[PDB]
Amino acid sequence: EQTIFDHKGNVIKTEDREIQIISKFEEPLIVVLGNVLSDEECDELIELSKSKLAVNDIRTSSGAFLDDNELTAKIEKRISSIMNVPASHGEGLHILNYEVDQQYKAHYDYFAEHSRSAANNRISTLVMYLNDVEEGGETFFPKLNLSVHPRKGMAVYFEYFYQDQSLNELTLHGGAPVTKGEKWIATQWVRRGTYK
Amino acid sequence: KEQTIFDHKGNVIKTEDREIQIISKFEEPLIVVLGNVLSDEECDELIELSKSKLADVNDIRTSSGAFLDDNELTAKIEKRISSIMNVPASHGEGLHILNYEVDQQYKAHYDYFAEHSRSAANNRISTLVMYLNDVEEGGETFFPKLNLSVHPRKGMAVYFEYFYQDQSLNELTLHGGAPVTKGEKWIATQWVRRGTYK
């Protein structure tokens, strides 16, 4: 019933950037956000991931974990304002990329009840689109019949810390195949308690 | 009920004069949030035109809207809109401008006419709402049966359609305008009919 995300109105004023609230799906809460990252910040995250990863599935699963520097600290501070959870609960920015004919099957961001990580589980996600995708790559929620299309600098926030578990399961989401171009995203996954 | 009128796949709609962004889709009934629909200048011009048209207690501003006279600007915008909606501008009612001050809203309603209306014989099938300014606080377009809201953002738009065979899908397009609590909200609408209109 109550959400972690606690922002009314049309903008979120962070210390260094005014974020636009574009659309909300109210329960489970999914929010499309504009002006989250500058174009330069998007390009820098992509550059850092290419440098960090210089036959696994890192690019499409766990993501390139960026080493802490001022850029990551700056962005993590901003997104802590958006998500209403301290950056100390975040896993840190992870960069994923999908080429033509790559996708991800619909899944939950939270860990399974049996899981090693389930004792301090994820509670919310921010997905930041780092580039424009020529065709495909939408983030889709199949139990809600909702999709969000990539747009450079925008993001989708969603949360899954409800007492009613069915609300958490409604956040099942996949990445539709890229059919032209490429898709780059950054994620911040945040835990219930502090992380590392 | 299965197919939609809106027929655009991918992430952009390339019109003759502007690339429109597809931001988000609620799939059925179809509601699409669109970016880059109107330039900043076009938004400001439409607001100015409506002020000119309206120049003693009638509710034109919050109901039917200022109907802009057909000129170069309205024809250009209506052509662009026709590409987005996949329905010729000849089916449109023409751009109507509405504005909401603090503590003004609209109760959730359907855009299509009721069965009893003379207008139901050539009913509305789809709507485009274009946000012409930024709204300091409030003013969201909300769909209460779907738990979806779209917040005003200058130059963006919300498209939705209600020409399904299953009437329950059309009824899910019930939508309202939440009160403005700070600033003011300006919108342009294009309502499209099944057949040609005037």
Strand partners, A12: A19
Give the tokens for residue A77: 């501070």
b/e sequence B63-97, b meaning 16+ C-beta within 10 Å? eebbebeeeeebeebbebbbbbbebebebbbbbbb
- Contact criterion met (CB < 8 Å) for A147 and B10: no
CB contacts < 8 A, A to B, total 85
> Are B98 and B62 in contact, with CB atoms under 8 Å apart?
yes
Using a CB–CB cutoff of 8 Å, tell me whether B137 touches chain A: yes
Ramachandran area for residue B74 (φ above 0: left; ψ -120 to 50: alpha; else beta): alpha
Please answer whether residues B174 and B127 qualify as being in contact, where contact means their C-beta atoms are separated by less than 8 angstroms: no
> Do the Cβ atoms of A33 and A156 come closer than 8 Å?
yes
Quick one: which H or E segment has residue B33? strand B31-35
Q: What is the amino acid identity at position B90?
A: S
* Centroid of chain to Cα B122: 18
Taking each helix axis from N to C end, the angle separating A70-83 and A39-52, rounded to the nearest 10 degrees, works out to 120
Q: Is B152 on the interface with A (CB under 8 A)?
A: yes
CA distance B151 to chain A (A): 5
Q: What are the structure tokens assigned to B36, written together?
A: 């880059």
Whether residue B145 lies within 8 A of chain A, CB to CB, comes out as: no
Rounded to an integer, what distance in angstroms lies between the CA atom of residue B61 and that of residue B50? Answer: 9
- Residue in chain A lying closest to B25 (CA): A147
Contact assignment for B23 to A23 by CB distance below 8 Å:
yes
Question: Is the backbone of residue A35 left (phi > 0), alpha (psi -120 to 50) or beta?
Answer: left
Token reading at B189: 């609408």
User: What sign does the CA torsion over B48, B53, B59, B64 have?
Assistant: negative
Q: State how far the Cα of A5 lies from the Cα of A187, in Å rounded to an integer.
A: 17
Task: Please name which of B132, B127, B112, B133 lies closest in space to residue B190, comparing C-alpha atoms.
Answer: B127
- Coil, helix or strand at residue A19: strand
Establish if A133 touches chain B: CB-CB under 8 angstroms.
yes
Phi, psi values for residue A150, rounded to 5°: -60, 140
Query: Environment class of residue A94 by beta-carbon count within 10 Å: exposed (0-12), middle (13-18) or buried (19+)?
Result: buried
B100 assigned ligand-binding residue: yes
Asked if residue A150 has a cis previous peptide bond (ω within 30° of 0), the answer is no
Interchain CB contact of B24 with A (< 8 Å): yes
In contact, B77 and B189? CB cutoff 8 Å: no
Judge whether A32 is closer than 8 Å to chain B, CB to CB: yes
Enclosing H/E stretch for A30: strand A30-34
Q: How far apart are CA A190 and CA A122, in angstroms?
A: 5
Peptide bond before B29: cis, by omega within 30 degrees of 0? yes
Among A149, A178, A183, A184, pick the best mutation site for testing chain B contact (most B Cβ within 10 A).
A149
Beta-strand runs (E) in A110-181: 122-129, 135-136, 139-141, 146-148, 155-159, 173-175, 178-180
SS3 B150: strand
Structural domains of chain A sorted by starting position, each given as residue range(s) with its CATH number in brackets: 9-192 (2.60.120.620)
Burial of A4 (0-12, 13-18, 19+ CB in 10 A): middle
Could you tell me where the DSSP H helices lie in chain A?
Answer: 39-52, 70-83, 165-169
Which residue of B6, B24, B135 is the best one to mutate when testing the A interface, meaning the one whose CB has the most A CBs within 10 A? B24
Comparing alpha-carbon positions, the chain A residue that sits nearest to B179 is A9
The answer to whether the Cα torsion of A38, B32, A21, B152 is positive or negative is positive
Q: Does A148 touch chain B (CB under 8 A)?
A: yes
For the record, the structure tokens of B174 come out as: 């019930």
Residue A124: both structure tokens together: 């919310």
CB A14 within 8 A of CB A78: yes
What secondary structure letter does DSSP report for B10?
Answer: S
Using the Cβ of A23 and the Cβ atoms of chain B, whether some distance falls under 8 Å is answered with: yes
* Interatomic CA distance for residues A161 and B173, integer angstroms: 29
Q: Under DSSP, is residue B88 helix (H, G, I), strand (E, B) or coil?
A: coil
Positive or negative, the CA dihedral A38, A40, A46, A52 is negative
Q: Which residues contact A40 (CB under 8 A, 6 or more apart)?
A: none
Q: From the CB of residue B33, how many other CB atoms can be counted at a distance below 10 Å? A: 24
Tell which residue, B163, B194, B191, B193, has the closest CA to residue B94.
B191
- Declared resolution, Å: 1.4
Q: Is B23's CB within 8 Å of A151's CB?
A: yes
* C-beta separation of B143 from B30 below 8 A: no
CB B155 within 8 A of CB B39: yes
Are residues B95 and B128 in contact, defined by beta-carbon separation less than 8 angstroms?
Answer: no
Instruction: Report the distance separating Cα A76 and Cα B68, nearest Å.
Output: 47
- CB–CB of A164/A70 below 8 Å? no
CA atoms within 13 A on the CB side of A177: 5
SS in 3 state form for chain B? Answer: CCCCCCCCCCCEEECCCCEEEEEEEECCCCEEEEECCCCHHHHHHHHHHHHHHHCCCCCHHHCCCEECCCCHHHHHHHHHHHHHHCCCHHHECCCEEEEECECCCEEEECCCCCCCCHHHHHCEEEEEEEECCCCCEECCEEECCCCEEECCCCCCEEEEECCCCCHHHHHCCCEEECCEEECCEEEEEEEEECCCCC
d(CA A176, CA A7): 29
Cβ(A150)–Cβ(B11) under 8 Å?
A: yes
User: What is the rounded CA–CA span in Å between residue A175 and residue A169?
Assistant: 17
Element (H, E) at B72: helix B72-85
Query: CB-based contacts of B23: which residues, under 8 Å, 6+ apart?
Result: A22, A23, A32, A148, A149, A151, A154, B32, B33, B34, B35, B156
Instruction: Decide if A146 touches B, using CB distance below 8 A.
Output: yes
Closest CA of chain A from B23, distance in Å:
5
* Among the partner residues A9, A23, A132, nearest to B24 by beta-carbon distance: A23
Q: Are β-strands B157-161 and A30-34 bridged in parallel, bridged antiparallel, or unpaired?
A: unpaired
DSSP A118: G
B115 shares contact with chain A (CB less than 8 Å): no
As a residue count, chain A comes to 196
Q: How far is A73 from A95, CA to CA, in rounded Å?
A: 15
Chain B positions touching A27 (Cβ under 8 A) are 147
Q: Which residues of A are annotated as a binding site?
A: 98, 139, 183, 187, 189
For residue B31, which residues of chain A lie inside 8 Å, CB to CB?
Answer: none
What residue has token string 């991931």?
A49
In chain B, DSSP finds a helix count (H) and a strand count (E) of 3, 14
Q: Whole-angstrom Cα distance, residue A138 to residue B9?
A: 11
- N residues, chain B: 198
